[PDB]
Amino acid sequence: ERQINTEYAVSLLEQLKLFYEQQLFTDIVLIVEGTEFPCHKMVLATCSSYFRAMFMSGLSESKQTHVHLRNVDAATLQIIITYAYTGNLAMNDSTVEQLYETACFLQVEDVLQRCREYLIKKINAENCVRLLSFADLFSCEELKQSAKRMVEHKFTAVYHQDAFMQLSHDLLIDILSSDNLNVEKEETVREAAMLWLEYNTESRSQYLSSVLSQIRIDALSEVTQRAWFQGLPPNDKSVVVQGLYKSMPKFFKPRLGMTKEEMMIFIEASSENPCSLYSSVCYSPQAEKVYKLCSPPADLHKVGTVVTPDNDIYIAGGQVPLKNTFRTVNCFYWFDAQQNTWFPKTPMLFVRIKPSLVCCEGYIYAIGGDSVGGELNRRTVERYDTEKDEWTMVSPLPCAWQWSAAVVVHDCIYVMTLNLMYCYFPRSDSWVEMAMRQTSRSFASAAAFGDKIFYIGGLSVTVEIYDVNKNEWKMAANIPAKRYSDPCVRAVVISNSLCVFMRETHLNERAKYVTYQYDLELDRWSLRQHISERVLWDLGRDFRCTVGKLYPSCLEESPWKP
Amino acid sequence: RQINTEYAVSLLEQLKLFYEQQLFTDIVLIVEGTEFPCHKMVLATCSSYFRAMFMSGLSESKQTHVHLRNVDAATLQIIITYAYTGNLAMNDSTVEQLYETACFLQVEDVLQRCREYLIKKINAENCVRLLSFADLFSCEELKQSAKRMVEHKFTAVYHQDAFMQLSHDLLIDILSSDNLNVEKEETVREAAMLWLEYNTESRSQYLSSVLSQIRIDALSEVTQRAWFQGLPPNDKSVVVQGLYKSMPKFFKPRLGMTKEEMMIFIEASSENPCSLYSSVCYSPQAEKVYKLCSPPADLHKVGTVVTPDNDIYIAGGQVPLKQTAFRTVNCFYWFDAQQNTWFPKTPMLFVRIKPSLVCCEGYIYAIGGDSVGGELNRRTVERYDTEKDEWTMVSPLPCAWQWSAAVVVHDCIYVMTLNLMYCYFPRSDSWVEMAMRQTSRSFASAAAFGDKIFYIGGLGSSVTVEIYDVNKNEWKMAANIPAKRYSDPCVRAVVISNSLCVFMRETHLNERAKYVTYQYDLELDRWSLRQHISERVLWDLGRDFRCTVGKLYPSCLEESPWKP
Missing domain, CATH: 2.120.10.80 (Kelch-type beta propeller)
Structure with missing residues (x-):
């Protein structure tokens, strides 16, 4: 038994979509902030792996005609259901983020891969750091790496992105400590760390210590000390001590962007x-x-x-x-x-x-x-x-x-x-x-x-x-x-x-x-x-x-x- | 646009996987003690009977063990596996029960497929059988192809054993047609005579109708006394009937004598x-x-x-x-x-x-x-x-x-x-x-x-x-x-x-x-x-x-x- 399609792969799928639209054979209905989605179970299994573990586990929700699924958007779940019923996603360029979020929540591998490819192809100029933080929020190796390199290339020419300010430490450490900075000078990354820190000072004090150690002696021989004397919180003594340590070790090395x-x-x-x-x-x-x-x-x-x-x-x-x-x-x-x-x-x-x-x-x-x-x-x-x-x-x-x-x-x-x-x-x-x-x-x-x-x-x-x-x-x-x-x-x-x-x-x-x-x-x-x-x-x-x-x-x- | 082939086949194989590996299989078909765990969606997308059975409001909308009777195990299995992958294994033997179960479950795709296969399979040694089958189940296209192929092959062999077991209406439609292929008009006569003498009182009422379709050139000659020999005893409603009824039905030559x-x-x-x-x-x-x-x-x-x-x-x-091509x-x-x-x-x-x-x-x-x-x-x-x-x-x-x-x-x-x-x-x-x-x-x-x-x-030559x-x-x-x-x-x-x-x-x-x-x-x-x-x-x-x-x-x- 193989899989020959005598004008049948589409016939059955068309009939399934017709049934979804006619509110027919609805053995399960999804409640999404008051909106009803009377679909069926077999199909939701093929698509969502969460619904795969939902319509099989011995928990009481399998014997519940009305399930109240929350933390999901109505339009995204609707497009996921219609993709499960017809195979066509017709994704736009605006709702890709929420669609990928709902796909990762429902563990729908095919649409996940589709949106991952669409995002990896569309890192043009501006959404780079945004989708990079997105891929840092939802573990995505492919996106993470392409976005990492994309930022290493363009971020080191603008270093003023509004989205770049709201980044998690580990991601910023990975970005700054990498040797892929496309910068012909070493002071631009210094002032970029400096700007970030003048912005969220106090709150990320340890983070600023680490970002100074991340810039290393390469760009630590600057006004970083005077700027810190200017913005440091009062009654801080050990902070100056740990800052005085950060000026000579951390393997002083040159960079790569200077070889332009x-x-x-x-x-x-x-x-x-x-x-x-x-x-x-x-x-x-x-x-x-x-x-x-x-x-x-x-x-x-x-x-x-x-x-x-x-x-x-x-x-x-x-x-x-x-x-x-x-x-x-x-x-x-x-x-x-x-x-x-x-x-x-x-x-x-x-x-x-x-x-x-x-x-x-x-x-x-x-x-x-x-x-x-x-x-x-x-x-x-x-x-x-x-x-x-x-x-x-x-x-x-x-x-x-x-x-x-x-x-x-x-x-x-x-x-x-x-x-x-x-x-x-x-x-x-x-x-x-x-x-x-x-x-x-x-x-x-x-x-x-x-x-x-x-x-x-x-x-x-x-x-x-x-x-x-x-x-x-x-x-x-x-x-x-x-x-x-x-x-x-x-x-x-x-x-x-x-x-x-x-x-x-x-x-x-x-x-x-x-x-x-x-x-x-x-x-x-x-x-x-x-x-x-x-x-x-x-x-x-x-x-x-x-x-x-x-x-x-x-x-x-x-x-x-x- | 069309439908993404990638997901189309991915869904098809995933549906088939849920079927073979008992998983989301909800309704189970109980046929002669054989279990058939399957889904309702796939059955509704093909069989009109199953679509009607589940979408209704009857107890079968909330049932699990339906005892589907008057069906076969292998036929239901091949129908289900076709509904799950699109693969129909049509041999040269099981197509009869295949069409039977397809007409029972009202599945149009497999019906058309087996109808085409039988339109290809129509030959001499199964013409009368296929015609009786197309008369049992309404298959007008197959019925006409049978009838014709039948007609000709029937008037060329007239020795089929299935010819004796045929309905009266089908025999009347065959004999009274103007498409029979016979070099003489006496072979159909003896064929009708032997079909009538296959029984006796079960064909007496049809005797008055079968002679009404054959020309009168042989309804005044021999094979009237042979029926009187096989006539029921003392029956005086058929002898004199055939005596004073051999006058209209204007004898017209057939088409088979034009070869x-x-x-x-x-x-x-x-x-x-x-x-x-x-x-x-x-x-x-x-x-x-x-x-x-x-x-x-x-x-x-x-x-x-x-x-x-x-x-x-x-x-x-x-x-x-x-230009040469x-x-x-x-x-x-x-x-x-x-x-x-x-x-x-x-x-x-x-x-x-x-x-x-x-x-x-x-x-x-x-x-x-x-x-x-x-x-x-x-x-x-x-x-x-x-x-x-x-x-x-x-x-x-x-x-x-x-x-x-x-x-x-x-x-x-x-x-x-x-x-x-x-x-x-x-x-x-x-x-x-x-x-x-x-x-x-x-x-x-x-x-x-x-x-x-x-x-x-x-x-030249x-x-x-x-x-x-x-x-x-x-x-x-x-x-x-x-x-x-x-x-x-x-x-x-x-x-x-x-x-x-x-x-x-x-x-x-x-x-x-x-x-x-x-x-x-x-x-x-x-x-x-x-x-x-x-x-x-x-x-x-x-x-x-x-x-x-x-x-x-x-x-x-x-x-x-x-x-x-």
């Missing part, structure tokens, strides 16, 4: 093992090393990169071989700065090929990139919401462009094509016409350095500088490159200084990597650093470059023979 | 260019061309067979896959001689292209025809069971042949190829080497007339004829068919009117195709002009068309409207 080296993330590199096609690696300007990264899909290629001002990496679009015995997928991913993995996000609505993602005003803007090709209005765009986690359609492009580039300058969208340029106003959602270039060049990219756009390359060494306040295109100079070669130019910001990363290739000659330092008033690319081939190998042709901060300890060095 | 020997064609050239091919038929007696229903889903590249019981079947073939399917079908439609049957195991369907000893033999496997046994020859409705493999052909034909002579299968021949012994399931032909010819057909095989034509004798085991020449020179005759060997005739369509240079059949004199070795097919009735058919010998009804079929 501005590095050079690359994608689609020349793979070492012939079994793989491309790879994503990184380069260190100061450390002069070449680190690697894990492929987000591990088989799909032709992706686009973007870096938010908060140093976040995203990947959208791309094409993957069909593996029949290259199909385009609109999937989306995000790079973890510590786990060295890729957590997917809400996919796009159109399968794009090499999308150009631009970040502005906290929103991700994907401009062009072979949306579907057969659009009525072929020139359209689509943006992303980093807070609401959804895609919003905006005003479509004014001219259809291929192999285009797009940057962001002064909180405005700027997309560049062969010769035209349009500025998209995020406040009014419209395109305004901008200056036209006198040269028609494609297959090139642009960089947003300061208040000037530097469109480099095209087919070459065309250096066409554009300014927003002036609205004009001008030439500066030609990059010094060896003749009889085809340079692959890459313009990007580094250390608040405009530089370039170019590679020259000749006939019967090897490729050479070298970055130059360009000056604004000099119009010359001074030799900054020549990338030695002993550490970096060939990259290819379809590789991309972008600036971002990474961690050396989480990532791994790329092994390659000099 | 004429016809030339059934398939894959003929479609008249309207919207369709690829069609199926027509020639009337050697009516001299017209009646249309036939299209092959099932325009099934092309198939084979035909006409059993000695005059039944048409279709096996193999290919359907255009959803064709996929081969192993579907099997059966032609309804009255409803003018192709009823589906049990498909084969392997797909075939142009299979040679041959009937022998009640089995349908499809010998070769482009086997899919193409492995070391590139034949996959299969036999079909007309009793069990299933296929069974037989001894494979020793040699792989292509574009071959097969006939049946002396209860044996004779498959013919370019030059070789092998005879299959069904009793021993073996192949024996036969005589060798001296001419290499293919793409021809053979007709089995008596105890001789007549391989006509071969390669020609007028070469090689006659083979089974008792002599030798291939000899007889003559060549006199045809017009510089032409390509399309020969078709067939048996009709107890004589070997040929359907040979010839085409001249810059001329249209001409249809004419000849009668081959067996003792004189000469093809005589039996009849010339005028082109005013029969149009072009094509090249890949087949022909077979069979009987059809002109009444149920309609004339094909087409210009000469």
Whole structure:
């Protein structure tokens, strides 16, 4: 006997739901603050494990037609009952907390796992500490850990969340004592503990002692003593004694967030093992090393990169071989700065090929990139919401462009094509016409350095500088490159200084990597650093470059023979 | 949206778990001392009786030990396990009590399932039993399928033991119908006579009604004194009744006596260019061309067979896959001689292209025809069971042949190829080497007339004829068919009117195709002009068309409207 479903799995379930709704065969009724729920017993067993032990134990409640169940919400119990009768939960985004609470109370494992997944997928920006305290209240390892890391990453950039103040000690100890604080400085966590304590002083006096010992000598060499002399309760002597002990021991160690080296993330590199096609690696300007990264899909290629001002990496679009015995997928991913993995996000609505993602005003803007090709209005765009986690359609492009580039300058969208340029106003959602270039060049990219756009390359060494306040295109100079070669130019910001990363290739000659330092008033690319081939190998042709901060300890060095 | 499959099956298995492992099982069914702990919700979701029993207000709304009587243990068990998992184990024996308990408990799903199974299971040796069963329980669709299949099979066997134990209304509906298949009107007469003489005074009152449905051509002749012999003694209310009642009931001829020997064609050239091919038929007696229903889903590249019981079947073939596009399917079908439609049957195991369907000893033999496997046994020859409705493999052909034909002579299968021949012994399931032909010819057909095989034509084709004798085991020449020179005759060997005739369509240079059949004199070795097919009735058919010998009804079929 297996489980074949000859149009019967749904028939029986439909009949069960009909019976629940008709007040039929009601052998048990739930009283929830005056509201009656005349359901049956067999089904409540399958769902609630509390009702499983309720409709079987030899206690008098099993022989009680009317049971008065309290500490449960009416709407949550109703949705749980209808899920038990139809399998459809249709959960919203607001009532997830009370639903999970009632599921943990009733011990309904399936809806518990469903809500756990829905919560672990929806830790976006704000409910992080709230759902972290929630998972601390209701033991939930999966939620606890994802939420822990999420806070270690974003909490160390706001450290002012209203919900962060109301936290239990053990959770705060686990948060602060961990070595995953994404902070480039050691005083921010100090003042964050300090603010918390100035808020609930006296009440959590032992807790404040522990949080001072948790900050350790690392951040104990500050005004912590004077602030305490200011707010301590009178007639306290041993407290000063125990505070004087907390300033030198507790294994003084450094932290991890300080290792935010501005590095050079690359994608689609020349793979070492012939079994793989491309790879994503990184380069260190100061450390002069070449680190690697894990492929987000591990088989799909032709992706686009973007870096938010908060140093976040995203990947959208791309094409993957069909593996029949290259199909385009609109999937989306995000790079973890510590786990060295890729957590997917809400996919796009159109399968794009090499999308150009631009970040502005906290929103991700994907401009062009072979949306579907057969659009009525072929020139359209689509943006992303980093807070609401959804895609919003905006005003479509004014001219259809291929192999285009797009940057962001002064909180405005700027997309560049062969010769035209349009500025998209995020406040009014419209395109305004901008200056036209006198040269028609494609297959090139642009960089947003300061208040000037530097469109480099095209087919070459065309250096066409554009300014927003002036609205004009001008030439500066030609990059010094060896003749009889085809340079692959890459313009990007580094250390608040405009530089370039170019590679020259000749006939019967090897490729050479070298970055130059360009000056604004000099119009010359001074030799900054020549990338030695002993550490970096060939990259290819379809590789991309972008600036971002990474961690050396989480990532791994790329092994390659000099 | 739909229903979450994950929970749907999780709930189903959890419900089944609560059933087998006695847990929340509340109501228990007491049947012949066997315990059946189960729930009320599952029983209500399927059985209408159980739904009515619990939701009511009677003592059963608060009872636990219901003594369900007039049921079976295994049937209730399989019904409960189906209600708990959706799995119905339908064998070939317990479907009767299954339908009984389903009609008792009023469970629509299992009722429809077993009704479909019995609509598939309807055959000869259970036609009358299934009809009596569909008369006992109201199963009008099953009742009609029974009646029809019944009708025909009843008027082909009329030896069923269950036929004696039948209700009067059912017998009246069977006999008085205009769908009986009998070459004469006297067999139904003696069938009614024996059904009446099965008893005596229990059939006397029905005697006055059964004679009211049979024509008066036999209600004035014999089998009136035979009833007077079996008449109750001194009964003077039946003798004179039948004496002065043999006057109305205007004698009208039935439909079963309209089976004429016809030339059934398939894959003929479609008249309207919207369709690829069609199926027509020639009337050697009516001299017209009646249309036939299209092959099932325009099934092309198939084979035909006409059993000695005059039944048409279709096996193999290919359907255009959803410009050249064709996929081969192993579907099997059966032609309804009255409803003018192709009823589906049990498909084969392997797909075939142009299979040679041959009937022998009640089995349908499809010998070769482009086997899919193409492995070391590139034949996959299969036999079909007309009793069990299933296929069974037989001894494979020793040699792989292509574009071959097969006939049946002396209860044996004779498959013919370019030059070789092998005879299959069904009793021993073996192949024996036969005589060798001296001419290499293919793409021809053979007709089995008596105890001789007549391989006509071969390669277009020609007028070469090689006659083979089974008792002599030798291939000899007889003559060549006199045809017009510089032409390509399309020969078709067939048996009709107890004589070997040929359907040979010839085409001249810059001329249209001409249809004419000849009668081959067996003792004189000469093809005589039996009849010339005028082109005013029969149009072009094509090249890949087949022909077979069979009987059809002109009444149920309609004339094909087409210009000469």
